[PDB]
Design a protein around this ligand. Structure first.
Ligand SMILES: O=C(CN1Cc2ccc(Cl)cc2[C@@]2(CCN(c3cncc4ccccc34)C2=O)C1)NCC1CC1
Ligand SMILES: O=C(CN1Cc2ccc(Cl)cc2[C@@]2(CCN(c3cncc4ccccc34)C2=O)C1)NCC1CC1
Ligand SMILES: [Cl-]
Lengths: 306, 305
């Protein structure tokens, strides 16, 4: 029993974190085999950020301008290249702690663990979701750039995020491990703002199923809804539209509890209209949207507390 | 910017988790040097749990009755002993991944990271606090016994909890690594219940300071209070009494924000008597009490391990 915001064990990722320094700029790198991946803005000063010409800044650099430190050992850079917004530093030593891994680009609504790092040293691990506006609500200070997001389903680490910046509203933006930004952001200090964010409806529904599995049903009702009527109401509360794909993905949770997806949608409609009236759901007074259907199945018991 | 419920990196603990099997019971063990530590109830069947005589159950066991598996390697048990509610299995191989460590017993209000494990394999990591009633609000299924709680300071892992059982309300109970239970619990199948819990006041105050550090200031006011007048409010709302020690511990957070502790107490008093009026603090509609003053300082400074 219980339901917590749970991160993947971070050990496999901790063994990949290194410090990358270019001149006066220091940040984190990810060392997999003989390559260290890091944000390309490691080659920029604060003034370079207004309108950086990364190609012009990079051509002036040699391999020995990049200092890479793994623990208390200096790695030797023997090559460098830029791929989108990521710098790939070829080193002369393969990481002996390289886990089984993949680079995966995730969609909004998907969750992942973040290993926050400073100076190549891990400080903490927490769970995040890619928001519908492509930002993440992380906890990152200056020096955290290059910290990564990942999932570890079945002993293989799937790297999905690398940290690059904090937006004026205090939320965060970054790239996949190929250097492609999530959202319409650029690694430039120009006017950029997080678009209006919305609630991840399929995740709220998954978390309501989690509350039912753990033995709570106070929020259910005798009503049902059509998908379009549900969407017409939900969008009035800044909730993402629920698609037929989301209904399909909720199938196993619907089967385990015996509650049809559109019946749970009717409960969600009522909760949006009424609030919780002094009650909580899984120890929360707000509707939680950073647990996916897959996360609930992973954490919750396969047996419902009927 | 940002404020999240953050756990310590779990790598140093993952390298210590093993599977321990005794007959039909399978749970997790902690392998440090040549000893594997695990709940002593690994030697019990469901019927034994009704009224177990652990010394009598243990004397009937040989070293070869304990199957210890580290990854896909079988460890050989060469000795066994019991210390309080923990079983210590001497093995023929020292763990090459043993970190620098200490066994520490924590007080209620203190937080720690839990590395939830099943069959000796880590599944997840989350943060939690020892409640004033000595239970923890964890997330554990059958097979999670032997999973541990810990904190890190520099390179040293301080092991503070080992998981043993779930109570009827869905909360959890366990021991320190010397096998002493937190709370008035026993490792037996009998009627046991979590006592009435209270809110960790010093932690709520620390989290209000974290909200001010992050730009949330709507709840601040021109008022102050005495510690005596605040404690009368705390008792009325099921909050733990705030002591001069708690005020001293909040000193660095008070200095960073320029808000006196008793000044923050007057803000909490008004929140307790009026609610949030449709507002949130750090994305929460409830007053959060599972961040200590040290957790707030550590997260807002970037301490590494
Ligand atoms: O003070 C700056 C200037 N930043 C320009 C800029 C522009 C583009 C890119 Cl890709 C990167 C950056 C920087 C590189 C470091 N960085 C940070 C990343 N993660 C957490 C942070 C926490 C505090 C300060 C900085 C952080 C950036 O956003 C610095 N940004 C933050 C202001 C609130 C808005
Ligand atoms: O059905 C039982 C019988 N338990 C007796 C008992 C008595 C004393 C001790 Cl130390 C241990 C135990 C057991 C050993 C495993 N265990 C569990 C630990 N953590 C999460 C669990 C989740 C589900 C089931 C069991 C769990 C215990 O509490 C099993 N407990 C669950 C009922 C709510 C209360
Ligand atoms: Cl995805």
């Amino acid at each position: 029993s219980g339901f917590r915001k749970m991160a993947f064990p971070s050990g496999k990722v901790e063994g990949c974190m290194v410090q990358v320094t270019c001149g006066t700029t220091t940040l984190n790198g990810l060392w997999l085999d003989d390559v260290v991946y890091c944000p390309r803005h490691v080659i920029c000063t604060s003034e370079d950020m207004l309108n950086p010409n990364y190609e012009d800044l990079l051509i002036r650099k040699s391999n020995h301008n990049f200092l890479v430190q793994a623990g208390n050992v200096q790695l030797r850079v023997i090559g460098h290249s830029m791929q989108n917004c990521v710098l790939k530093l070829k080193v002369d030593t393969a990481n002996p702690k390289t886990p089984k891994y993949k680079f995966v680009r995730i969609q909004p609504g998907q969750t992942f663990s973040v290993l926050a790092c400073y100076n190549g040293s891990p400080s903490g691990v927490y769970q995040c979701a890619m928001r519908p506006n492509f930002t993440i609500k992380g906890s990152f200070l200056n020096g955290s750039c290059g910290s990564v997001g990942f999932n570890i389903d079945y002993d293989c680490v799937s790297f999905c995020y690398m940290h690059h910046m904090e937006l004026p509203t205090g939320v965060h933006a970054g790239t996949d491990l190929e250097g492609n930004f999530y959202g319409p952001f650029v690694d430039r200090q120009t006017a950029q703002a997080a678009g209006t964010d919305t609630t991840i409806t399929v995740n709220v529904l998954a978390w309501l199923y989690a509350a039912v599995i753990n033995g709570d049903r106070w929020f259910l009702n005798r009503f049902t809804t059509t998908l379009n009527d549900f969407n017409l109401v939900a969008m009035k509360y800044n909730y993402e539209p629920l698609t037929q794909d989301h209904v399909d993905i909720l199938g196993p949770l619907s089967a385990q509890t015996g509650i049809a997806v559109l019946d749970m949608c009717a409960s969600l409609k009522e909760l949006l209209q009424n609030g919780m009236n002094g009650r909580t759901i899984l120890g929360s007074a707000l509707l939680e949207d950073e647990f996916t259907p897959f996360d609930v199945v992973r954490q919750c018991s396969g047996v419902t507390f009927q």
